[PDB]
Amino acid sequence: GKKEFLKHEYSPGHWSIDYTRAGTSIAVITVRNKYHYSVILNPTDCRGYRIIIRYLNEGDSTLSSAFNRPYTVSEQRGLNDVASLMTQVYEKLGLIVQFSQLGNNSQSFDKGTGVTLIGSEEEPSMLHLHMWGRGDPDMEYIAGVPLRGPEPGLMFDLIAKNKTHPINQHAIKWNEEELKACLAMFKLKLAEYVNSPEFTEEFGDTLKVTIHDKK
Amino acid sequence: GKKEFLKHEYSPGHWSIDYTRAGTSIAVITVRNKYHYSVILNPTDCRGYRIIIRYLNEGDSTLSSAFNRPYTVSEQRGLNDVASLMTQVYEKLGLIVQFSQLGNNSQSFDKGTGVTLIGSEEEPSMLHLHMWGRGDPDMEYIAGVPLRGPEPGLMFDLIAKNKTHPINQHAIKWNEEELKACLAMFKLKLAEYVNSPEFTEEFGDTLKVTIHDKK
Ligand SMILES: [Cl-]
Structure with a gap:
């Protein structure tokens, strides 16, 4: 029992479930008519136009049922397919694309017991990447x-909550008009891309994209 | 022309072309009968049992033709499919999987001109992830x-050659004996997974895996 999963009940209004309330949703993307993923701009850090790609659920399962557990190869594969799609939006903006699947902010270690714990009271462990x-x-x-973000060549620090020493970067909160502009362009570039021959040839029918209408 | 790609000829014996010489090769994996990828243990950093998944070439193109250029969505998607497969090796070992596509060590910036340069003398830009x-x-x-590696919850620093400030983490070179053990186990776990029922269900015929034996 070196790796353990937290057992915990999160409120329906917790940001992990009510994920659109921050007002940063770009789209929902369904893989192989079964696995559902959200793509949102990161609500707490605008550097590099960061997005979070997150696995919501499979079929009609609850969002909660996809917290604090091992993920199947299909679930991981679907995340990575949605990532492959989103790389093309960065490319069409003229940017170098980078991405990371980490999860440090919902992972902890107890040196006394040697146990790695997946999930916390404040933040469920979700299958997601940046x-x-x-x-x-x-x-x-x-x-x-x-x-x-830092100049090309330097490491982009995604910012871990737990640090052993201070770092030389920090998250930058969104200005409201800038968030709205960035969101609109991500939606447009994605919608354009989905209409391209390259999208059809590579993804065929396996990815279905629904752009989030602002509310 | 704000993003520029280096025009440069690399030696045939350069480590990027002669990739197996470090002696850390796990497998070559071909995606959709066309896109060829290598999976190796990172020759300079054993922490976390790091691997590198690298795009070699398509069909019969040279390795050099896949340096210092934009990558297509098919090339990116194939890299991410091989990544999805390799996550299962870490899962089987009881590890939390993390991964990053960065490229910082082959990317540079000239603030006076505003130009981002992809590729260098010492290191071509290759499609790859960690x-x-x-x-x-x-x-x-x-x-x-x-x-x-650092305790779970802390950020794993993959090391950028270029840094604005000194850092505490550093790469740990492979001990000879340890490398043999780690390699053997990565090959074994991959072999056990490949063509098992779960692999066939997810990947079907999409991925062809050739595990490397030392000669
Ligand atoms: Cl300035």
Whole structure:
């Protein structure tokens, strides 16, 4: 029992379930008519136009049933397919694409027992990854929105809650008009891409994309 | 022309072309009968049992033709499919899987001109990503080989050659004996997974795996 999963009940209004309330949703994407994923701009860090790609659920299962558990190869594969799709939006913006599947902020370690715990009271462990663009940090690749982040060549720090020492970067909160501009362009570039021959030839029918209408 | 690609000829004996020489090759995997990828243990950093998954070439193109250029969605998608497969090796070993597609060590920036340069003299830009495992750093998840890396919850630093400030984490070179054990186990776990029922269900005929034997 070296790796353990937290057993815990999260409120329906917890941000992990009510994921659109932050107002940053780009789309929902369904893989092989079964696995459902959300693509949102990161609500707490605008650097590199960061997105989070998150596995919601399979079929009609609850979002909760996909917390704090091992993920199947199909679930992982679907996340990675949605990631492959989203890389093309960064490419069409003229950016170098980077991405990471981490989960550090919902993982912990007890040195006394040697146990690695997956999930916390504040944050469920969800199958998800981060994606962002690199380029000139001062260039507005989307009009009115500087890319931000460190210059190419340097490590982009995604910011772990748990640190052993201070770092030389921090998250940058979204300006409201900039968030709206970035969101609109991500939606448009994705919608355009889904209409391309490249999309059809590579994904065929296996990915269905529904752009989120602002509420 | 804000993103530029290096025009440069690499030696045929350069480590990027002669990839097996470091002696860390796990397998070559072909996606959809066309796109060829290598999976190796990272020759310079054993922490987390890091692997590198690298795009070699398509059909009969040279390895060099896949340096210092944009990658197509098919090339990216194939990399991510091979990644999805390799996640199952880490899962089988009882590890938390993490992975990153970065490229920082082959990307540079000139602030005076605003130009991002892809590829360098010392290192071509290749389509590739890093994967590793998290857990108790002192536990030998593979007998004879402690996992190493920082405790779960902390950020794993993959090391960028270029840094604005000194960091505390550093790469740990492979011990000869440990490398043999880790490699053997990665090959074994991959072999056990490949063509098992779960692999056939998910990947069907999509992925062809050739496990490498030392000669
Ligand atoms: Cl300046």
